[PDB]
Design a protein around this ligand. Structure first.
Ligand code: HXA
Lengths: 45, 279, 328, 219
């Protein structure tokens, strides 16, 4: 199993970090936690 | 050898100024403990804290009247209110202590039954019953004995009795051999029976602990707490009832004995939270 | 030899750290959350919770011997299943909402059918075959469930068949938690050997293993993207691991915190993650800057578990006291 | 609650809440015990005396009191992971095989180590623990046949049953650092059925008395 684990394809850490940053910034508006939600339509308030 | 009015005023002010912060701290601690969980002992602690706060509220009038020119430096309209506010807590504390001792005895001598009947509703009901009984007894005695009642003289004032001149405070210059039996009955029914119940529950709890196989440290701590509570109740209530029964037995009592009894009763509000404050 | 080659490959791929890439990002300001709803139906310590697909109904299992499904919008209770065994430490909610699973000291992931013709909840299946305490149960589909036990192994079960089909082995320590990818094709398991292994639903073998933790892992959760996950161990640290990079990206720790971590979850966008702690406090860490954003100190004993809804409207944190809080 | 569905939901919630309150009231007075052992002592002989996976559940009522005993001998995993689950139990029943001192897995040393580990747990400080010593006759036969010096080289003296039992009890009892807030009810298992249940009931009654005193404020 260790030999199979060793023989894998790995990408650069910088590219993966950039992809994660792009995903985080793309969905920042959709996240209701980063941007406070008004109580007018908030189900919990 | 009556105490000078200045010393009495100073000791009253000191007692109030020490009791009030301790009383409010104990009340806050009891409320905080009850917020997390409600226990039967917490109900009694809250009732005792409320009675202590009421006694502190009533204290300043007595403190200002303790002076030489302090016969009655207040309107007579609220004199019965002050008399009730000063007399009720003295017996209320003893009743609460007796109820707490009874609960401890029931929980120690009969553990299975007490656990099966662990209900704060019963504690609230018994507390309400004690409050109602004490209030009814005080009201009936005030109606029957104090001037202005059905059996009192028509030409009299409610809580005011100055056959010579001036105007004294309520129960400050009570006529001898007038409400002697009534005061004696109140003292008995409000302290002696609760004292006997507390002593019986204390000895029963001690016997149960001795028969128990618990740790010696726990038994010693419980015995010390119970003994301290009993000593507090004695040193805070007993002298006043002893003075009352001595006056009832023969009217030869008179002078500084009543002042000493009132001072000892006032020491209750400042000494009780030291042993039972739940800080 | 192979381990040395793997370590060398991991070291070579580490071109730069996550902090350098995220340096140019404007830091997020402090966020304050208030308990909108409080649930007090439970009378004992709770151990697990799981939100529904519609982000309205959640299920919580407590130690008194039963689990209650809560309608968080109205706070009223809609169901109460008396569990056969009082010792329960995990619970799950089906994506369709029809089934609810639970497990504990007894090696059974009992499944209950919420929707019944008679209108009364009944037990649909009783899965057996584990020899250790059931750490977690999770639903893949309406007929597939993945359970992790204390026998250092995980298994995939079939509801209709009633017997496990594929089993996963290789963990040195007892498995404590697991999380499912959004596509429900691969998953990880957090064992007590301070390692996390990436498994397969279909064929079932560990492609990759992740190490670096100094203590046993108690919580794990995938990134919303699905290409990364975060782990929570007992040494007061959270490490973000990358499947493609096969190495730790960023660590979340501080000198003030020394207590262990019970539950770890991500937000809707994954920018911030909420991690439970043994000091009844929840720290809202930053997934890109390792900077705290807020503290949820609304609990009393210890934050047993916490979860975030699919749409991310609110986060619910369970705890060892009888009260459950909904934070928004 | 103008809508009929809202009223129905509120009524269902109230019914569920009242059922929860009733269940909590029923379980408040119910007594739970935990059974622990080392090696072959996990399968306690109390259930066998009563007769003649995962947690094993046993129910028996003595003197109109319900007792629940849990067997953890089938939980062959890390104890610390699930030890916090067994919190708030009335007492912990510990059984030690006195005849296992000669046998080597060392069995007595393992039992002492496990007792020390469970007694020093932060979650078991308040919970009382009951110590049971089994096979007293077998232990006395073994010490009559084989010397006891092998198990305890430091211990010296005669080879009678009384002093050996006293020494074993003292060595088991002195394994806790907190001797003030923790109490151990050591006992020797005998063929009489009534003695064991009487001792367990006495320990449970003592725990109940302590809990009542703590609730009333005498702690
Ligand atoms: C003026 C007050 C004088 C006496 C006041 C109350 C007195 C005596 C009450 C009880 C003792 C003996 C028997 C009745 C059983 C009673 C239940 C009362 C209390 C325990 C409640 C608790 O603490 O949990």
């Amino acid at each position: 199993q260790l030999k199979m684990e060793a023989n894998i394809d790995r990408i650069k850490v910088s590219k993966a970090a950039a992809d994660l940053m792009a995903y985080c910034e793309a969905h920042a508006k959709e996240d209701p936690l980063l941007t406070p939600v008004p109580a007018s339509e908030n189900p919990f308030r | 050898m009556d105490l000078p009015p200045q010393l009495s005023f100073g000791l009253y002010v000191a007692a109030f100024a020490l009791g009030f912060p301790l009383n409010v701290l104990a009340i806050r601690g009891a409320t905080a403990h009850a917020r997390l969980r409600l226990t039967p002992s917490l109900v009694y602690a809250l009732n005792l804290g409320c009675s202590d706060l009421l006694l502190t509220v009533s204290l300043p009038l007595k403190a200002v009247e303790a002076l030489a020119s302090g016969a009655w430096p207040l309107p007579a309209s609220l004199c019965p209110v002050f008399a009730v506010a000063h007399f009720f807590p003295l017996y209320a504390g003893g009743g609460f202590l007796a109820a707490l001792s009874a609960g401890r005895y029931l929980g120690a001598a009969f553990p299975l039954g007490y656990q099966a009947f662990r209900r704060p509703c019963y504690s609230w009901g018994v507390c309400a019953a004690i409050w109602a009984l004490v209030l009814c007894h005080l009201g009936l005695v005030f109606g029957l004995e104090a001037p202005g009642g059905w059996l009192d003289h028509s030409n009299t004032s409610l809580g005011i009795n100055t056959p010579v001149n001036g105007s004294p405070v309520c129960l400050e210059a009570w006529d001898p051999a007038s409400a002697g039996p009534a005061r004696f009955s109140l003292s008995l029914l409000l302290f002696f029976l609760p004292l006997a119940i507390t002593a019986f529950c204390y000895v029963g709890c001690l016997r149960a602990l001795a028969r128990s196989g618990l740790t010696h440290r726990r038994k010693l701590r419980a015995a010390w707490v119970a003994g301290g509570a009993l000593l507090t109740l004695l040193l805070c209530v007993g002298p006043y009832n002893a003075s009352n029964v001595a006056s009832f037995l023969y009217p030869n009592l008179g002078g500084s004995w009543r002042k000493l009894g009132l001072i000892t009763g006032a020491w209750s509000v400042v000494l009780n939270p030291l042993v039972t404050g739940y800080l | 030899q192979l381990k040395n080659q793997i370590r060398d490959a991991r070291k070579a791929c580490a071109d730069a750290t996550l902090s350098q890439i995220t340096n140019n990002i404007d830091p997020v300001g402090r966020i304050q959350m208030r308990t909108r709803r409080t649930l007090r139906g439970h009378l004992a310590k709770i151990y697990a919770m799981h939100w529904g697909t519609d982000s309205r109904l959640l299920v919580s299992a407590s130690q008194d011997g039963k689990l209650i499904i809560w309608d968080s919008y109205t706070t009223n209770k809609v169901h109460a299943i008396p569990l056969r065994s009082s010792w329960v430490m995990t619970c799950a909610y089906a994506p369709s909402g029809n089934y609810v699973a639970c497990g504990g000291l007894d090696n059974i992931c009992s499944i209950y059918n919420l929707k019944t013709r008679e209108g009364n909840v009944r037990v649909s299946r009783e899965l057996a075959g584990h020899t250790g305490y059931l750490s977690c149960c999770r639903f893949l589909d309406d007929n597939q469930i993945v359970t992790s036990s204390g026998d250092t192994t995980c298994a995939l079960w079939d509801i209709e068949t009633g017997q496990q089909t594929t089993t996963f082995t290789g963990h040195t320590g007892d498995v404590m938690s697991l999380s499912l990818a959004p596509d429900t094709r691969l998953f990880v398991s957090g064992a007590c050997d301070a390692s996390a292994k990436l498994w397969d639903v279909r064929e079932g073998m560990c492609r990759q293993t992740f190490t670096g933790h100094e203590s046993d892992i108690n919580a794990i959760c995938f990134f919303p993207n699905g290409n990364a996950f975060a782990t929570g161990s007992d040494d007061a640290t959270c490490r973000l691991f990358d499947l493609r990079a096969d190495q730790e990206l960023m660590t979340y720790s501080h000198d003030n915190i020394i207590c262990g971590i019970t539950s770890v979850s991500f937000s809707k966008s994954g920018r911030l993650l909420l991690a439970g702690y043994d000091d009844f406090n929840c720290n809202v860490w930053d997934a890109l800057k390792a900077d705290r954003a807020g503290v949820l100190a609304g609990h009393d004993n210890r934050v047993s578990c916490l979860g975030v809804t699919d749409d991310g409207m609110a986060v619910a944190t369970g705890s060892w006291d009888s009260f459950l809080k909904i934070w928004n | 609650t103008l809508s009929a569905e809202d009223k129905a939901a509120v009524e269902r919630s109230k019914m569920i809440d009242r059922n929860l309150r009733e269940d909590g009231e029923k379980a408040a007075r119910e007594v739970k015990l935990l059974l622990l052992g080392a090696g072959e002592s996990g399968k306690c002989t109390i259930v066998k005396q009563m007769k003649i996976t995962g947690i094993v559940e046993t129910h028996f009522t003595f003197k109109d009191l319900h007792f629940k005993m849990f067997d953890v001998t089938a939980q062959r995993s890390e104890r610390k992971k699930w030890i916090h689950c067994f919190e708030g139990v009335t007492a912990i029943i510990f059984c030690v095989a006195l005849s296992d001192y000669d046998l080597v897995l060392n069995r007595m040393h393992a039992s002492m180590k496990l007792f020390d580990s469970i007694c020093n747990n932060k979650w078991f400080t308040d919970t009382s623990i009951i110590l049971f010593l089994n096979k007293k006759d077998l232990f006395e036969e073994k010490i009559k046949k084989s010397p006891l010096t092998i198990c305890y080289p430091e211990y010296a003296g005669s080879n009678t049953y009384e002093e050996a039992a006293a020494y074993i009890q003292c060595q088991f009892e002195d394994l806790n650092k907190r001797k003030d807030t923790k109490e151990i009810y050591t006992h020797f298992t005998c063929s009489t059925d009534t003695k064991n249940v009487q001792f367990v009931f006495d320990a449970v009654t003592d725990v109940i008395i302590k809990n009542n005193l703590k609730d009333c404020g005498l702690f």
